[model samples]
Target: DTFTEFTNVEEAKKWGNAQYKKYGLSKPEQEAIKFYTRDASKINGPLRANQGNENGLPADILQKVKLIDQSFSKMKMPQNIILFRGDDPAYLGPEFQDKILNKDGTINKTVFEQVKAKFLKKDRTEYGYISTSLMSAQFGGRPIVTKFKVTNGSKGGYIDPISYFPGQLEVLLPRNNSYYISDMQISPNNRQIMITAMIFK
Candidate 1:
C-alpha cells in the first residue's frame, strides 16, 4: 500500500522551508538560490521557476542533470529499492506502528546510509541489479530473491519476507563497477547526484 512519490520544486521548497526550522538550511539551498538569480536570463527568473518542472531546474542545478539521469537509469539500485518487504507499517495498514518515522514525521533511521555503506564495503558486494552470470559461489551460488519461504511451513511465520541481497552485487554497484554513469554532477558537498540529461546518450 505504500506509494512512492516525486515532489515538484515548490513542494520540495515547502518542505525545505518547513525543514529549515528543524534540519536547518544546508548550503545547497543557498547555492541554488544564487544560481537561480544568476541564471535568471536563461529561463524563469530568480525563484520564479521553483513552480516549474524538474526540467526547469537552473543550469547550475541542471548541469548535473545528465549525470544524475544516467546514474539513475543505468544504476543498480540498493537492495531496498529493488526488493519489497511487506512488514513496513505503510504496507501493514492502520494497526501497525511506524518506528521508522521521526517525531516530526520524517524518516527516523539511518538504515539507508548504513545499508548503502555496507554494500560499498564489498569487493563484489551483494545487493543491486545483478546479473545471474556474475554471482559467485560464496553468495548462495545464485541470484538472490526478494521472496523468502517459511522455515517451518505449518507454524506461524513472520507476516512478510525481509528484503535483502548478498554482499557480492551490492559492492559492485556502489563502487561504480556495476552501474555505468555516462554523465554526472559533482555537488557542493563534493558528492554527485542524478545521472546526466541525455548528454552522454
Candidate 2:
C-alpha cells in the first residue's frame, strides 16, 4: 500500500527536507534538487548576454541616448530602463534644461526636470511568496546585495537646459541620456543598497 498523505506548499518543503535525511543524499545534491523540483524553471529565452530584443539596452526599444562620455559609454543609449533587477540596475536619463533667467538679472527662473527610475529589491517576492533571497556577501552576515529607493531633493530639483550659451550654458546632461544612480558596491558594515540621482550647477 502506498501512503499518499497530501498537504500544502509549506508542508511540501518540509517533506523535501525529511526525505533528504531518509535517503542520505549529499547536502549539495539534495539541496539543488529540492530547489529545482519546487520552482518553475526559466525556459525559451535568449542565452547570450544582452540578448533581449533591442540592440542597445532593452533590446526592445529602438532609440538613441544623448551625451557621449565615460558615463555614456557604460549606458545603453536612448534607454528607458524602468525595471531594475538582477545584475543590471535601472538607468533613466538625460534630463533637459528648463530654467530661464530674467532679462535684468533680477528674477532668477528655475525649471524642474521630471524623470522616473526604480531600483531592485533584495528579497524578490512574487504572488505573495518570496521568490528568491538577495545576497551581497558584504552586508554583515546578510544575503542581500541591493535595494531600491526614490530621490526627491535639491539634487533632483530644478535645472536649466543645455541652451542659452553665455559663458558655459550647455546641457551638462543632454536629453535621452541614461544615468545609473544606484550604489552597486555593497559593504558588509553598511548592510544596505541605494538609488539616487544628481545634477551640478
Candidate 3:
C-alpha cells in the first residue's frame, strides 16, 4: 500500500522488477509502462472536436483508477488496503480539491461517495464504452461534452487486467512528483500519461 516513486519508466521498471523478484513472482510485472509505443498511432493524430453525431473531445473525464497490490498476500497478515476505489471526479469546480483533499495535498478520504459509474467491469465486451451514452433533447446524437472509452478497464494490467487480482493499493500517479515518466491522464491527447505504479508486496 506504499509507492516508490520514479521519474523515468526504465527506473520504475527496474525497481519494480527488483522488488517483485524478491517476492518470487514468475513474471516481474514491470512492463506495463510502455503504452504510447504499443498504440503509437492513436495517441499521435489529429483528434476531432464536437460536431454532432460523433462529436466532442475525449470526455474531460473524472478518470477513475485503481491499484492491485498482491505483493504480500503470502503473509496473510498485512491488513493493508486490499481494495480501495476513489472516483469523485467532480473536480470541475474550485470546491473540488479542497472538499476532498487535506491542506497537505493528501486525500481527505471522507467526502467521497460511490456514484453510479464504477468505470471498470466485465459483462460487456465493447471497447469504446464511454461514461455517457447519448445526448439530451436529441434522439440521434453523441456525447457533446465528453469523449468515449477506447480501451476497457482490463487493458492496463500488462501481465493481466487490473481486475485479474485484488488488493488495496491506491496508485500514486506520475507528475505528482514530476519525474514519473508515466502519468494518470486518459483523454484522447493524453496518450503519454500512462501509470507508473511501482508495485510492492
Candidate 4:
C-alpha cells in the first residue's frame, strides 16, 4: 500500500513528528501539530476551566486565525487525512506545501502583511489559541461518511475534536454564506497551490 499504516498511536505520532520536522514548521505550527496529534487529551482541564482566556485576543490575531482558516478549508484535502476543526473557522495542517508559504518555504510576507493589516495596529506579536476544544468532523475516504460532527467538551454550542485525530492533519474554514461562495484547494501531492475567494451580504 502507498499509505504508511500504523498499528498504534505512538507509531502514528512518530510519523507525524517526522513530517513536522520535514516541513520545518514554525513554533505555532509545530505546537498546533503536537497538540492535535499528541498532547490533545491532556489539555482538557485548562480548556474547560477557561483559565487561559486572555481578556481577549486582538483583532489582528483573530483575523489571522480567520485567514488561515479560510485558506486551509478550501484546499483539496487528501484521503485518509485527519482534520481537527476549531470552534472558530481558522486552522492548518501537513501537505501545506506552498499554500501560504513562499518559494523558500517561508511564510509569505505579502499575504501575511495583507492579512495582518486587516486587524493589526501597533502590536505585531503573533498570538492566538490553538484548538483545544471545538466541534470537528472528518470527510472522504473509501466509504464516504456523512457530515457527522464529533462531540467533545462539556459546552453545548460546539465541542473540541482535536483529541480524536492522530494522523495527517488538514485545515478547513467554515462559512454560513448564501452568495457566490469561493473555495481554494492545495494539491496534497504537488507543490502548487491555487486560491479563490468571495464575499456576500
Candidate 5:
C-alpha cells in the first residue's frame, strides 16, 4: 500500500530488517526496497539539534544546541512560565503575575508556594503528553528539523498590535531582527538527539 512507503533510508532499512526476519526476503529484494526508501527522503536545511543522552549527535546540530542553551540562560526576562489549567474562571486573573513580579516589572521573590487553601486535585484528569523517541541507527540519531519565518516589524518605540482572549494572556518575548530558541532530548543510547522545540528567524 502507498501508506507503507518508507520516508527515508533509515526507515527503509528498518522495514527491510523486519521483513527479512518475518518473510525471509532475499538480500536483492531488501536492497531494492532500501533503494526506493532512500529515494523518498528529502533534506531540510539550517537545522538545530538537542542531545538527550551522552551519545554523539550530528556535529553541526550539537554546536547549535550548545550555543542556544548558553544564550538562553543569560536572558534577563521571561524567567518563569505558569499555566492555569482548568475550566473555572476563578483560576484566571492578574494576581498570578503579581505573585511573581513587583510594580516595576522586576521579579520579587525568586520563588513562591501555592495557596494551599485554593488548590484542588482530581482523579482521571487529562492534560497533555508527547514523546521524543530516538531514531534508529540509519538516521544517525538526528532529530527532525523544521523552519519558519517571522515578519511584520515595529520600528523605534512603536508597539505592534496586541490581541487577547478570555482565559488567555499573551506574554511578549524579547526578540530582535533574528532570534532562536532550542530545547531537546537525547536518546537513551546517547547516540541520537531529539529536538523538542526550536524557533528561529
Candidate 6:
C-alpha cells in the first residue's frame, strides 16, 4: 500500500517534502533539493500559466530562466539514482545495464560514456519538463515513481491502469509520445524503484 494518489503536482510535491522531513537524508540529497528548487517560482509561474503546453518550450524563457540549463546535470540528480535517459527507444533498461555494467556488477566508465551519447537530446521539450520535475524531487532519497499493479483475482493476472498526477495534467495529458517514460515516488511496503512507462508497450 505504498501508493497515495495526488490531486495535483503541488499536492504530490507537498507529500514528497513531508516524506523528506520524516525520513533520513544524505548530504547529496540535501544539496540536490536546494539546487533544484532554487528560483523555482520563476519556473513554476510560467509553467502554470501555460499549463498543458505541448509545444517545445519557447526559446525566450529558457534564457530568462537561467537555472534551466542546456545540458542535464548529472550532479543535480539524486546521488546514485540510477539516472536513466528515460526517452530512449533503442535500449531497454537491461540493454543499457548490460552494455555498461562490468562482470563484477560495477559500471564500466568507458562504455557508459559511449551509451550516454545516444540518449534523447529532447530535453527542455515537453517531455523534458516531466523528466526534470521528477528528478528535481530527489530530496526524499527515493526512486522516481511510476504506475504499479498486482494480482486481480488471485489467479496472478495484473491489470495496468492509467496514472493520474493531478497538478501535472498539463504535461501529462494529450500523451507526449516523445516522453516514453516519467515518474514520481510514493512509499510502498515492498518498495522498489518505479519505472512505469506511460506508453503501453
TM-scores for candidates 1 onward, in order: 0.18, 0.18, 0.21, 0.25, 0.18, 0.24
Model 4: runs farther than 4 Å from truth?
1-5, 28-60, 63-79, 82-201
What is candidate 3's local distance difference test score?
0.23
Instruction: Point out the worst 10-residue segment of candidate 5 by lDDT.
Output: 154-163
**How many residue pairs collide in each prediction?**
27, 14, 11, 9, 4, 8
lDDT of 6 by residue, 1-201 (tens): 222334445664554344334323334433323333444344444554556352334555544333233212211211111212222212325656455445754445565545445432321224223322322233233322333211111111000011122222111111122333343222352222334333221
- Runs in model 1 with CA error above 4 Å? 1-52, 78-201
Q: What is the C-alpha lDDT of each candidate?
A: 0.26, 0.23, 0.23, 0.30, 0.25, 0.32
Give stretches of model 5 more than 4 Å off: 1-51, 76-80, 83-201
Candidates' RMSD to native: 22.5, 22.5, 17.6, 17.8, 22.5, 17.5
Worst 10 residues of 6 by lDDT: 153-162
Give stretches of model 6 more than 4 Å off. 1-97, 120-176, 179-201
Best by lDDT: 6
- Give the clashing pairs for model 6: 2-187, 2-188, 7-166, 8-166, 8-167, 9-167, 52-170, 145-184
Q: Write the per-residue lDDT of candidate 1 for residues 77-164, one digit (tens) a residue.
A: 1112111111232321243234434466443345324323433223321121122211122322211111211111111111001112
Residue range 1-201, candidate 4, lDDT tens digits: 122234454554554444333333344533443453454323333332433332243454334334333333222212223223222112222332234466664445455444334423321111222231111223211111111121121111111122235333432222222112133333253222222222111
Q: What value of lDDT does candidate 1 attain over all alpha carbons?
A: 0.26
Error of 5 at 107 (Å): 39
